[model samples]
Target: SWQTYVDTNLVGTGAVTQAAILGLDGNTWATSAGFAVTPAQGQTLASAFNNADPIRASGFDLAGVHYVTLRADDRSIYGKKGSAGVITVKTSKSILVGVYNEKIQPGTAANVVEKLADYLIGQGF
Candidate 1:
């Protein structure tokens, strides 16, 4: 199930400190324990996936904290505050969310999230 994708594929990979899979509408399909993403947070991410101008203009919030936009596009969005950051990879059916702290390289976190998204796309998810 989708939960395994979060627990094994994402969390088990150790590529991210926190991880989740959200529906395009911002509903949570799976999320790591204690990593709660509110509906408003999900909506903000969902909207930003399509048009990021406002996010780039004003930044956005996630998991109750705010982060400045580093980049946002159709397939992905990256945001950061200090050495911590968040990455999102969008597939046709859902969005993959990953969080990385100072302990992890942003590139590695991004690679993991994007690779999962790519695999999901290939499987027609």
Candidate 2:
């Protein structure tokens, strides 16, 4: 039984999938709200604009931008599979940064980035 338990923990017998937070356009803040649970076997969650046109219309170069940092601030829940059971999973904000230099905003570009950030915070993302 000890070996079985160890194997399960090692091989993902019990696992929790975390969503990836992405940048808006040229900003560095990760405002994408992650998912807590899903019914799919494997889920890839990413924030999308209402019509995918808002993002483009909003203005910002998607190129040269990479990497994102996710900060979980009392925004996630821990779940377990069973009638009733509890498992200890350390919770903390996860930071993921890109390897390359993301696009640098200048002049009016920086203002747009700040506006997007404000919108994200206001929306509670």
Candidate 3:
């Protein structure tokens, strides 16, 4: 079930380097192939993003450039961005998912993210 979920929603969308459905208690329900985020990190990030007061003040924009770098390589994180390239997203309280991809056209990146979000919603994540 988990593999099917990953194959259909994460890999099917394409352009997703890493993606995961994280439980409210910070457990990984499912994940895309070849990627991982520790439960502790997921919990911290989810909590930070879900906070209403902080988001209200900061406008849900992840401050500064957010990227994942590994072993002499770097990849830009994808999400909706404001004028200054700060990331933003409208949240659904019950679900938390994260995606990372190599630098690509902004439009394509947004499409991938939107599709993943929509599919998760459809599946009642």
| Clashes per candidate (backbone, < 3 Å) | 0, 1, 0
Ranking by lDDT: 1, 3, 2
Runs in model 2 with CA error above 4 Å?
1-105
- lDDT per residue for candidate 3 within 1-125, as digits (tens), equals 22344566544444444445544563445555344444464554456544344434433322223432111112122333332121223223333333544443446645655664565555452
Give the distance in Å from residue 39's predicted Cα in candidate 1 to where it truly belongs: 2.5
Candidate 1 — which pairs collide?
none
True-structure RMSD, every candidate? 2.8, 19.0, 9.1
How much is 102 displaced in model 3, in angstroms?
2.8
lDDT of 1 by residue, 1-125 (tens): 23566777566556876766675653557767456767665677667666667777778766665677867774557577778777666665666667657787777787766666666777664
Error of 2 at 56 (Å): 31
Q: For every model shown, what is its TM-score relative to the native structure?
A: 0.76, 0.19, 0.44
**lDDT to native, each model:** 0.66, 0.24, 0.41
At residue 104, what lDDT does model 3 achieve? 36
- Candidate 1 colliding pairs, count: 0
Instruction: Give me the displacement of residue 19 in model 2, in angstroms.
Output: 20
lDDT accuracy of residue 21 in candidate 3 = 50
Worst 10 residues of 1 by lDDT: 1-10
lDDT (10s digit) by residue, model 2, range 1-125? 11222233311221211122222233222211122223221121123223334323432122222112122223321122222111111112221211111122122222332343344445453
Q: Highest lDDT, which number?
A: 1
